[PDB]
Design a protein around this ligand. Structure first.
Ligand SMILES: NC(=O)c1ccc[n+]([C@@H]2O[C@H](COP(=O)([O-])OP(=O)(O)OC[C@H]3O[C@@H](n4cnc5c(N)ncnc54)[C@H](OP(=O)(O)O)[C@@H]3O)[C@@H](O)[C@H]2O)c1
Ligand SMILES: Nc1nc(=O)c2nc(CNc3ccc(C(=O)N[C@@H](CCC(=O)O)C(=O)O)cc3)cnc2[nH]1
Ligand SMILES: [Mn+2]
Ligand SMILES: [Mn+2]
Ligand SMILES: [Mn+2]
Length: 159
């Protein structure tokens, strides 16, 4: 099973200048809980944005060029990325925009955080057809002293 996990600001913005400009510790904690002990697939730009391997996960990087770091696994196509995960129950695709586009048709589950923040950005999450997806979990949180915007955790499953 393939799942996508992402955090979306208003208008599906997910990034600007190869960064995420907000800081929401509760959402990073949610990301860690839902990805720990699972393989994670990311594109090369997202690898450069994170800047280090994510511990406790098999890190798989898509790039058309040879890898430059043997602490992670480098693959050259979507099918190779999936194969490199082995026989696991759930593969997590962690972006960015181009990677989400390619994996969305193959995904059964979306873990989305909707952040109430207006962000200028240059990268968006794919347009997804709402009729294809059932909301099975949602949890709203107001802003607090640690998290400066309100946010909604949602899990959707392909109908
Ligand atoms: N808010 C969130 O949830 C979230 C999550 C992830 C990322 N982001 C943001 O998203 C942005 C990065 O997204 P992006 O769309 O620019 O880049 P991306 O999807 O991270 O990376 C694209 C790169 O991945 C490689 N790639 C993708 N598909 C491939 C394929 N089928 N075969 C081989 N290589 C492939 C290519 O690398 P080569 O050029 O080396 O071939 C391509 O240039 C940043 O702003 C980041 O902060 C946000
Ligand atoms: N909901 C969600 N939020 C994100 O911030 C996110 N980010 C990415 C890609 N970028 C990043 C950037 C940093 C870290 C990171 O530092 N993660 C630590 C945080 C642990 C914690 O804060 O409790 C990790 O071990 O996962 C992960 C992914 C992909 N999907 C996402 N999905
Ligand atoms: Mn092929
Ligand atoms: Mn197999
Ligand atoms: Mn806000």
């Amino acid at each position: 099973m393939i799942s996508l996990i992402a955090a979306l600001a208003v208008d599906r913005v997910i990034g600007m200048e190869n960064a995420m400009p907000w800081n929401l510790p509760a959402d990073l904690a949610w990301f860690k809980r839902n990805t720990l002990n699972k393989p994670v697939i990311m594109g090369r730009h997202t690898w450069e944005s994170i800047g280090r391997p994510l511990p406790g996960r098999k890190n798989i990087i898509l790039s058309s060029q040879p890898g430059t770091d043997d602490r992670v696994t480098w693959v050259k196509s979507v099918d190779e990325a999936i194969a490199a995960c082995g026989d696991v129950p759930e593969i997590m695709v962690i972006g960015g925009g181009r990677v989400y586009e390619q994996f969305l048709p193959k995904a059964q589950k979306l873990y989305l955080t909707h952040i109430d923040a207006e962000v200028e950005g240059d990268t968006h999450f794919p347009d997804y057809e709402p009729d294809d997806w059932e909301s099975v979990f949602s949890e709203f949180h107001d802003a607090d002293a640690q998290n400066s915007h309100s946010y909604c955790f949602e899990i959707l499953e392909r109908r």
